[PDB]
Subunit: 344 residues, 3 copies
């Protein structure tokens, strides 16, 4: 009985030390109403290069991608001139954060944003709008309004509004075509998003990093993963990649093949292969819903809002050291009635 | 060893008693499918007093707020007559709870609601629709349909549909302008909401109260906080405040200044300053999404629904007294092998 | 003191054994981003039999249900011919899973779905679209596009898009009228859904079963519950029930009464009465939101997507046996300083 109880004592002490150290961190889920919220960055990108009004409008038919490649081969474009000419069809006119009050704000309360306007992305030149300090959410979530002007009354012309975190401004626009929201030109749209905060625990085996460093790691991995295949193909870089700095930009002769490859490459690109550390404090913004207000307009109004609360996922340890010791003592006091003093 | 083990025993017993008493209550998160759900109250409010068709229609230009103030100064309106005249442009015709069945319900199954119609809010006179007993959600969530009639074929005229809890019917319409959903006149709209229940634990330091008392506390605090600034300005009360009962209603001369102040006052009003107790059983209704059905109509149809499940956040204590005693006993049996009997 | 401490020891040991065995399983809530997701089945069903263009179009007025019953009595329809003729007004033309890439997919990358097209449901003949293996969600959620062709330019004609799990393909279409989403004919629609996975624990008292068996149990219970009332009424089966296999299908004389009864029967049908076991691994798909793209079209495009992450609810036991033993030992070591050895 002393021998069986001692094999038991030792085993119940193993199980405890297991559940303390070798156990996954538990997760606390909350639906919080934060009085101040960090608004997302909004990247406005041009739609597929087969639909850019710089190509579509001139020619007669509705271009396809191969027709666009032939056009780029005929008129011999610098691929950087071609990237510059794409953004011309929204022509940002005004963007401001404003509140929905009982006396409509008029150019004095609304805070004016200045987009980046020089982002290079898979579809052309994109504009990023962002805020530097959080807005007050106590009464309601303020509205961002991006206004775009056009020259002609465009029909069936689209852009992409991608809502992301400013801490992911280096590797977010590339997926705007698939993760973005289609916005019709000359038509007011409302994109109500939802915020998902996740506080991860820094672990020795899996140490989380600041969002800046995780974004840099993802950007570097994306650049190497693009350049490997694009050097396999023709050994040049497209206008939307900055990594091989010496390696020259592609020309019109090589751009079609590279773009056709890169589309397929990006279709299956998976972030799991890019082994980068997690984020200790990560904020994501999902699209809660999209609404269309009114009919045709002479300006494209893009309204970004949230009608929802923040979803908080905090990682915490349910087992403390002071409970591990108590459980080991309980095992000792059940199986053998032992103690520190006793053993000693 | 006896002295170091005793300083240890005592410290492991402190940590335990800490984690039991001096610890935050843990939260259980569920996505429940309640067979019966309390439908929210729906407050239909007029849009900004610069857009009310009682002002906009008569004059030539599109009024601004200062033009409205000048008009209120010219035609000398009783501010209570002016609040009465605002609601005239939706003219409730019918509202009923109906189910989406395979044989459409026709005036015999649908339950008829009678709105309040006499709410006073920052924008004018508002109508509250509510249900007295829960509907059955077993098969699907029934639909509330509010029908509004108008005189002229109004163009670019809007109202505000605010979805709230009946237990918050005293301090909810005031924020309808910012927390509401814009509904276009003479156009069917669908406002699908989501329900967030949160069961808080009554704590000695932070004792929760019934939703009625929390709503009364918030109403009282809002009334005092409005009246302080509005007595600073001109020492009168607007048509949408009931608190200083003797204090006379404002007239046309003083209404412009008071309203202009009150807009700014409400822009930054924060409920944290209003220290009121939490709610033991609080139910919130967020807007899941908004859809537009059809084009122009001779009646404004507002459809309120839910296509989602309820989000339950229950506060509970993960540590019980019978586990505190066990952990203290384990600490005693590890560090010193002590016990009640022993010590005694 | 020995007697009071022993009544205490025994009681603290009861409380522990209670909280271990006789306690509800705890729930872990996560917002996961699964690299591969099982897309839902999409059931396209005709709208109410009073609005089917097979009836509405021929006659002059807008039929009501009683007018449809009179028509079914006049022209003497086989109720199976009548169920066949209803589906003719969407005429599936193409359905495929495609990704939103920077070079639009054209009939080579998109995977072609073949709907079931022979489902019998309360409203007529329905088409189920489904996928056999999960799609990759690493970069974005691919889009399902269902294309429908029509003969005439239909006005105010609707269908129902119900998003459900393939493991619930036997008892899901029946509620499509109430749980479905109204889609307007000849008009592109986007139905963005959200996924709710729930991993239940198999319990002796409440043993969960595979989704196939739970779906079969629900189908059987629905069939018996329909047939009981429908044999009370006229002792025949409607075209959308397969259970009493010998019992003949209803004819035009009896169909009106049976359908009128069955509508009311289905209005209050509750699954709680149908005592079937839970699902160990259940996946639900709720409608996140619905968007309308463009205006009139010659084809009905139904786009099914998700812009969101999966909501995971995993049931797990917070108390392990190796912690129960430790707590019992701690209770023994606190109240009496006992142990296995001691007692023995």
């Amino acid at each position: 009985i002393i021998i069986i109880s001692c094999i038991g004592m030792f085993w119940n002490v193993v199980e405890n030390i297991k559940l303390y150290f070798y156990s996954s961190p538990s997760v606390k889920f909350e639906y919080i109403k934060n009085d101040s919220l960090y608004f997302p960055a909004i990247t406005i990108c041009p739609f597929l290069l087969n639909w850019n009004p710089f190509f579509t409008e001139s020619i007669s038919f509705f271009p396809e991608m191969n027709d666009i490649f032939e056009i780029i081969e005929t008129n011999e474009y610098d691929m950087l001139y071609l990237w510059n000419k794409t953004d011309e069809y929204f022509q940002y006119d005004d963007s401001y954060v404003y509140q929905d009050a009982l006396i409509e704000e008029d150019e004095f309360d609304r805070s004016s944003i200045i987009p980046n306007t020089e982002i290079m992305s898979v579809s052309g030149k994109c504009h990023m709008y962002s805020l530097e300090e959080p807005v007050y959410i106590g009464n309601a979530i303020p509205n961002i309004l991006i206004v775009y002007n056009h020259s002609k009354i465009y029909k069936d012309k689209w852009i992409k509004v991608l809502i992301h975190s400013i801490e992911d401004k280096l590797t977010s626009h590339f997926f705007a075509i698939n993760v973005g929201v289609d916005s019709l030109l000359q038509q007011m749209t409302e994109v109500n998003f939802q915020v998902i905060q996740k506080i991860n625990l820094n672990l020795s085996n899996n140490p989380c990093l600041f969002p800046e460093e995780v974004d840099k790691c993802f950007k570097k991995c994306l650049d190497n993963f693009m350049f490997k295949d694009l050097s396999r193909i023709h050994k040049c870089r497209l206008p939307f990649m900055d990594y091989p700095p010496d390696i020259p930009y592609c020309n019109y002769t090589n751009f079609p093949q590279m773009y056709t490859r890169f589309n397929k490459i990006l279709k299956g690109f998976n972030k799991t292969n890019c082994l980068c550390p997690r984020k200790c404090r990560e904020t994501r913004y999902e699209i809660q819903y999209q609404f269309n207000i009114g009919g045709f307009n002479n300006q494209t109004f893009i309204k970004i809002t949230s009608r929802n609360s923040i979803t908080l996922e905090t990682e915490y340890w349910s087992y403390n050291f002071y409970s591990l010791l108590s459980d080991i003592g309980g095992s000792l006091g059940l199986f053998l009635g032992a103690s520190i003093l006793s053993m000693c």
